[PDB]
Amino acid sequence: PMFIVNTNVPRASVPDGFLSELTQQLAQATGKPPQYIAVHVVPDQLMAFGGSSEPCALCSLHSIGKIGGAQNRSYSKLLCGLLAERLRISPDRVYINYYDMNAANVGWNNSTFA
Amino acid sequence: PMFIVNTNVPRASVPDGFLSELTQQLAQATGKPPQYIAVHVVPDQLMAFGGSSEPCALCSLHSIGKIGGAQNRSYSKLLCGLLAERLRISPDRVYINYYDMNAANVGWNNSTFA
Amino acid sequence: PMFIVNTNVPRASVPDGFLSELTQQLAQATGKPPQYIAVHVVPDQLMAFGGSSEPCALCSLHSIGKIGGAQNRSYSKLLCGLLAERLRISPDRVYINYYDMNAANVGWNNSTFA
Numbered sequence: 004p005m006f007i008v009n010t011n012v013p014r015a016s017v018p019d020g021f022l023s024e025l026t027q028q029l030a031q032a033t034g035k036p037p038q039y040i041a042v043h044v045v046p047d048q049l050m051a052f053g054g055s056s057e058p059c060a061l062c063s064l065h066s067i068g069k070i071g072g073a074q075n076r077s078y079s080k081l082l083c084g085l086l087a088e089r090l091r092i093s094p095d096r097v098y099i100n101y102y103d104m105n106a107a108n109v110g111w112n113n114s115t116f117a
Numbered sequence: 118p119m120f121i122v123n124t125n126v127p128r129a130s131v132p133d134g135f136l137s138e139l140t141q142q143l144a145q146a147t148g149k150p151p152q153y154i155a156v157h158v159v160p161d162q163l164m165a166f167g168g169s170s171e172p173c174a175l176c177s178l179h180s181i182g183k184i185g186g187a188q189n190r191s192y193s194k195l196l197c198g199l200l201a202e203r204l205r206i207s208p209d210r211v212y213i214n215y216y217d218m219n220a221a222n223v224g225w226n227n228s229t230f231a
Numbered sequence: 232p233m234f235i236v237n238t239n240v241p242r243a244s245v246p247d248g249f250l251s252e253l254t255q256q257l258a259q260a261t262g263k264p265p266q267y268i269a270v271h272v273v274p275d276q277l278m279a280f281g282g283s284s285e286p287c288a289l290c291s292l293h294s295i296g297k298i299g300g301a302q303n304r305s306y307s308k309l310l311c312g313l314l315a316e317r318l319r320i321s322p323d324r325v326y327i328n329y330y331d332m333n334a335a336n337v338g339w340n341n342s343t344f345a
């Protein structure tokens with residue numbers, strides 16, 4: 004998978020080790036090798052959630068497979084947990100968009116995964 | 118819905134109250150409660166539209182339902198109108214990508230909307 | 232099409248002509264006039280790829296048509312080639328997500344392409 008977080012929380016509030024923690028937690032949650040996992044954190048963003056500029060986050064998880072009703076609930080618990088714990092963002096001010104990608108629609112190293 | 122706009126217009130050109138207006142107008146357009154609407158504005162971007170660096174924007178609207186032929190035309194008129202009037206971006210230099218999300222693929226508050 | 236690249240490469244390492252080069256090369260690759268094509272480059276990002284913070288890129292290509300198994304394999308070579316030469320990114324540290332958009336879900340100039 005690849006995971007992206009966009010947040011209005013300032014850069015300094017992102018803990019050293021946060022990217023590594025996301026990488027390892029996603030490897031465990033998906034059973035994928037950490038070697039292929041990509042993570043991306045974007046702080047200091049100009050955002051509102053419900054018209055409020057309190058801490059919030061907009062996220063996405065793209066994966067080839069391993070996306071579904073029950074799996075997505077488990078990811079959401081895991082990822083909101085991390086965002087609460089590490090960035091002090093309330094879970095009800097987080098959206099996570101899940102994308103089940105066709106392998107032919109993911110390019111890597113001069114080809115696709117198909 | 119969640120609405121993201123990326124633009125090369127500088128931050129100083131984003132008027133006070135713009136995120137509030139987007140929230141309010143998207144609530145009216147979709148009939149959804151403003152309390153659930155998220156908005157994200159990213160100025161000062163390195164962008165080109167048709168090989169020109171004149172003011173432009175690339176946007177996305179994700180919604181669970183409320184996405185379709187006529188609805189999307191109505192959203193485009195609204196949102197291009199706002200980008201023109203408030204950010205001084207010509208409508209012919211705006212793209213907006215619309216996404217109809219399955220509730221099972223949207224995480225929020227430690228769970229998903231499924 | 233529209234092309235977005237997010238990268239941890241610093242802004243000063245992004246050549247001034249990169250957006251125009253991408254525009255022109257994509258126009259040739261897709262058979263579309265360059266005036267239609269939009270490009271967005273986001274440097275200085277906090278990213279990890281396989282647990283490493285060496286230069287990397289996460290990209291997307293959206294297009295109305297011109298997306299499919301063979302076409303995507305070809306785009307991947309084109310884009311890995313440009314990112315490798317101009318941004319000095321190893322091609323095995325690039326992901327490109329491909330999206331085939333419905334014309335009714337792409338807004339432009341107060342309307343949609345449908």
Ligand SMILES: *C(=S)NCCc1ccc(O)cc1
Binds near residue numbers: 040328
């Ligand atoms: C997890 S193993 N990610 C690496 C493969 C991948 C899957 C989905 C997308 O969009 C990019 C890369």
Ligand SMILES: *C(=S)NCCc1ccc(O)cc1
Binds near residue numbers: 098100223
């Ligand atoms: C508008 S009411 N948004 C809240 C629900 C939602 C819909 C779609 C996505 O991607 C996130 C959240």
Ligand SMILES: *C(=S)NCCc1ccc(O)cc1
Binds near residue numbers: 214295
């Ligand atoms: C290439 S000709 N792009 C212009 C039309 C377009 C296609 C797809 C998306 O997402 C935006 C614009």
Ligand SMILES: [Cl-]
Binds near residue numbers: 067068069070
């Ligand atoms: Cl699976």
Ligand SMILES: [Cl-]
Binds near residue numbers: 295
């Ligand atoms: Cl086609």
